[PDB]
DNA sequence: ATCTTAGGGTTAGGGTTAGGGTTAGGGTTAGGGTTAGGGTTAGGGTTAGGGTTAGGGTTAGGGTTAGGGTTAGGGTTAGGGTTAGGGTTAGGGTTAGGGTTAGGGTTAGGGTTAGGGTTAGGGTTAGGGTTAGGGTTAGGGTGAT
DNA sequence: ATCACCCTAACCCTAACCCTAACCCTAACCCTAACCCTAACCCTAACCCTAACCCTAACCCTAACCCTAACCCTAACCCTAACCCTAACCCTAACCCTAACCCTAACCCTAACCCTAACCCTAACCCTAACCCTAACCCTAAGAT
């Protein structure tokens, strides 16, 4: 039985890993074809400058980083440390979006 | 050197050094690099590039105690 | 041709940092399908604004003008890339 | 003998319409305020939407396409689609009449 | 001599006013020019939006037997309309309450 | 023996009473009263219209309402039927006003 | 002649609160929320308030009107229709 | 003679002197500098479009200077409306006392 | 015979440029006219909360032993004043990162 | 820091004597050995890259 | 004693200025012209500050029970550790589609004015809505089966 | 669970009254028609930038698995805090009157703003050498055995 770290040891040493860092958490050809692939439904043919890509990317890590601090209030509030998804309906509930 | 190119570390040599300074402890420098795999690395390129990781918190924190 | 089931890019190992972004400790299994939901939400709204504008400005180019404006409409402002 | 400054409304305008969709349905004072109220807040907002519009693209001009343009991005889904018709509907009844 | 006038309402058949639409967007500081189209556009769609809520209204207020449009039954047409309340999420309607909901964890066991 | 509805009885027929009406529950004067106290602080010798004081009336109950709404979500995420003080803290947090 | 008020907030009583919860669908209200209520309502009316004098000390009058009220609402994000806005 | 190259306007200069104002020695990425611009251009913005709505309340056809004061005093939080109202006086007293 | 030419900006002792933003004024449809003292006050103001971000950008790049200021410090700098956080509440900060903050429960229990 | 301060013949034909003396790479020792006046070890490496993609430098 | 480890010092290579040059592009100054708004006054309208009443709404207290708080225990996941391999990343080109700039027209929108069509305000009335009084039904409560 | 009374409150129905909506009339105001005039916008054509596309290649992140412990969940129990109801009392709602005080139109008139035209000045690119930042590597200096 080698050396092994509880639960929780390395969820808050990655939480700390990630707080402190500023790049993006999503890799980046995935989301490329991900945006892509909506705008075909809006408008065929369509070309994208690599900084709307960017752009795009960086306000879609920015809503779900604020999306998960709220569910994470919200699972708190239910005596529990995980987020299940009804704390994220409740979040965007009362934020509006529903 | 010149005669010897300046590469820098993969991410299957960290965590070869990473294991062996768990396993061999930290400082045994010589066998880590006999019982592990790396890219034509010496005792002391462990040593420096250890450091490194450690300036970069890329070490597991010291255990509380 | 056509994309398709591009939505399962954005992998589980990715959505589990950007949780521990948001100080989270641990994530149901049942995350991950619902987060991928929200975010083509996200996407969809803001996309269909940028191609808005885009299409009015006579261009085929989505520009990242194109995009701060459509974010900015939705309350949500992104300063550094330009405006 | 001060004269007091007439209140401009869309009173009569909404009158109309009420008696074109409901007949014989009367409207109160304070529903009509709400009404008024409506207007003027949507007409702001499609207003303010081309203004923009018309200065990100460096033209000095509101035009039916910017006023489409806004109507759009603010009006959801339907109520988009049906309200394009019905301003492309007017302009083309207009410009035929001359 | 001067041909008789005809309102630009009458023309583009509408009831809502081109010509005041017009002068609040010269004087509203919207741009420089205001093209002869664009008060027409707007009047049609204020027309359009107008109409739509007061039909939604008026069929509130028959369900309630009432001859005569209160701002509850602006607000019930309203919040029961999703696309309508999509527009006017902040929108507070004096005198209109709110809708009729009660959360089923919290009525009686049987 | 007398008659006594049990608990959360009357509690809905309220619910019922107060979501079925349009009046202000909160008493006129004294809310004339609290908007006046609170006006003297950022400027003395200051007078409200009727309308001035109706308008803050209906913006301040509309906002407690909704309030109150959310509240009872966030009571109902932790398995409660009450509302306590950190549900309306839950509910602020999240709505960003905190 | 224009006197002080104080206490004002305690007017804001216990069924007042009660009846607003009701209209927000709330079956059972702890004794505690009666205090923090009051509190949320103390600093909403401020943040309004305070708009709307400013509002009308830009105008140079001295009489606040339900139109400063409503432009101060709207500032806000809580457009308020029914008073001449 | 070849097609002229249309030009970008910023603040980039001016915030390089009030950087080096502020902390003579610390420099500034160009990202940052895209915030710094994008931070500018944001208030300029909300401060000109709520003077402009005072404006049109009041039935005046003119910005003054009182506008921004009250625009800024409506949108600035706190300590911020009054230390950015007495910099604004300031400045217009000065540049009134020289013509 | 034209007197030298002082810039408007060095009558107010200011950084920012006053001429600049008197033809923004002009240009953006704000009104039909622009005062004197306009362009001067709006331009001291945003001199003033430049300042102020930089001051305090400059001590969390100084904090971080870091003698350039990047995205992070900004944000930084931003979210820890009360005053410039309820100024910049719906903005996102591209490469800024959040503060970190861990809440109470989840840290472990000794 | 310090103003920019360009490089000269001397400081030229001395760092090429060096190269050759001290061989490419000895850069601190041959700032020791020669006289480059308010010139660091860092400097006189981007001063012979300079050199390098200039071609003044030759055999 | 010698190959090995510690710790400070040097270097490699990508990235970031400083400065010098060039010039689109606009800011400043001077002088003429026009009007928005400051200043003053009068007069009408509005709100604040008294009073009085009565009746509905608030408050204090008693009885009771339901729901919140706590604990114990079992089953269910989530996450840590390990391994294989492929998907994303990094680098190097090509090309053509589209965004941008440059003249040349021209028609659409602004400006002005006379006159009539339209709309806001004031006056008047009757019917939709409300309030009071009397049944009637829907449903909650308790005790008995 | 299951009906069976008992009892309460929301519902309905009539009647009376009533005050607010809805219609009419008028005068002032602003929309429209007609006629210049000019520049914003449209159209065509050339020109250069960058987004799309195609290769190669190797990294390291992702997927899959197994094994546990930590977590969620529920059930049982206790007690205390909230609900419901009653009675005593108080303070809000409604109305009226009066008196300062405020809002605003009317009129005058003058700084303050707009609008050109010359004349520079400063910022905006570009491009290359010089300097910086930081991880990878080096050089000795003890030192475990």
Redesign the pocket.
């Given at each position: 039985k080698?050396?092994?770290?509880?639960?929780?040891?390395?969820?808050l040493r990655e939480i700390r890993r990630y707080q402190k860092s500023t790049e993006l958490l999503i890799?980046?050809?995935?989301f490329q074809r991900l945006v892509r692939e909506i705008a075909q439904d809006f408008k065929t043919?369509l070309?994208?400058?690599?900084s709307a890509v960017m752009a795009l990317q960086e306000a879609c890590e920015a809503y779900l980083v604020g999306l998960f601090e709220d569910t994470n209030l919200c699972?708190i509030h239910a005596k529990?440390?995980?987020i299940?998804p009804k704390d994220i309906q409740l979040a965007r509930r009362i934020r509006g979006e529903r | 050197?010149?005669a010897?190119?300046?590469?820098?570390?993969?991410?299957?040599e960290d965590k070869n050094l990473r294991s062996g300074v768990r396993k061999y402890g930290?400082?045994?420098?010589?066998?880590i690099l006999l019982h592990y795999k790396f890219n034509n690395?010496?005792?002391?390129?462990l040593?420096?590039?250890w450091r490194?990781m450690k300036?970069?918190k890329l070490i597991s924190s010291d255990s509380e105690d | 041709k056509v994309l398709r089931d591009n939505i399962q890019?954005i992998?589980?190992?990715?959505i589990r940092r950007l949780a521990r972004r948001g100080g989270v400790?641990?994530?149901?299994?049942?995350i991950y399908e619902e987060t991928r939901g929200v975010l083509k939400v996200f996407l969809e709204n803001v996309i269909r604004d940028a191609v808005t504008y885009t299409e009015h400005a006579?261009?085929?180019?989505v520009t990242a003008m194109d995009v701060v404006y459509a974010l900015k409409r939705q309350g949500r402002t992104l300063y550094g890339f330009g405006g | 003998k001060?004269?007091?400054?007439?209140?401009?409304?869309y009173?009569?305008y909404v009158?109309k319409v009420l008696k074109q969709v409901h007949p014989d349905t009367?409207?109160?004072?304070?529903a009509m305020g709400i009404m008024n109220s409506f207007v003027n807040d949507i007409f702001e907002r499609i207003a303010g939407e081309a203004s923009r519009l018309?200065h990100y693209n460096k033209?000095?001009?509101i035009?039916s396409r910017e006023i489409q343009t806004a109507v759009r991005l603010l009006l959801p889904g339907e109520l988009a689609k049906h309200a394009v018709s019905e301003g492309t509907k007017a302009v083309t009844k207009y410009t035929s009449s001359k | 001599a001067?041909?008789?006038?005809?309102?630009?309402?009458?023309r583009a058949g509408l009831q809502f006013?081109?010509?005041?639409v017009?002068?609040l967007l010269?004087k509203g500081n919207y741009a420089?020019?205001?093209?002869?189209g664009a008060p027409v556009y707007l009047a049609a769609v204020l027309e359009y939006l107008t109409a739509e809520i007061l039909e939604l209204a008026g069929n509130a207020a028959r369900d309630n037997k009432?001859?005569?449009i209160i701002p509850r039954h602006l607000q019930l047409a309203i919040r029961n309309d999703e696309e309508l309340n999509k527009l006017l999420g902040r929108v507070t309607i004096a005198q209109g309450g709110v809708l009729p909901n009660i959360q089923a964890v919290l009525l009686?066991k049987?």
């Open positions: 080698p050396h092994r770290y509880r639960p929780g040891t390395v969820a890799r980046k050809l995935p043919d070309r994208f400058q690599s699972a529990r440390v995980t299940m | 050197h010149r010897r190119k300046r590469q820098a570390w993969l991410w299957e930290e400082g045994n420098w010589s066998k690395r010496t005792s002391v390129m040593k420096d590039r490194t300036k970069l | 890019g992998t589980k190992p990715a400790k641990r994530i149901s299994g049942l006579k261009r085929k180019t | 001060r004269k007091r400054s007439r209140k401009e409304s009173s009569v009158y009367g409207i109160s004072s304070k018309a033209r000095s001009t035009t | 001067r041909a008789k006038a005809k309102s630009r309402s009458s006013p081109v010509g005041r017009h002068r010269r420089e020019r205001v093209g002869a009432k001859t005569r009686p049987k």
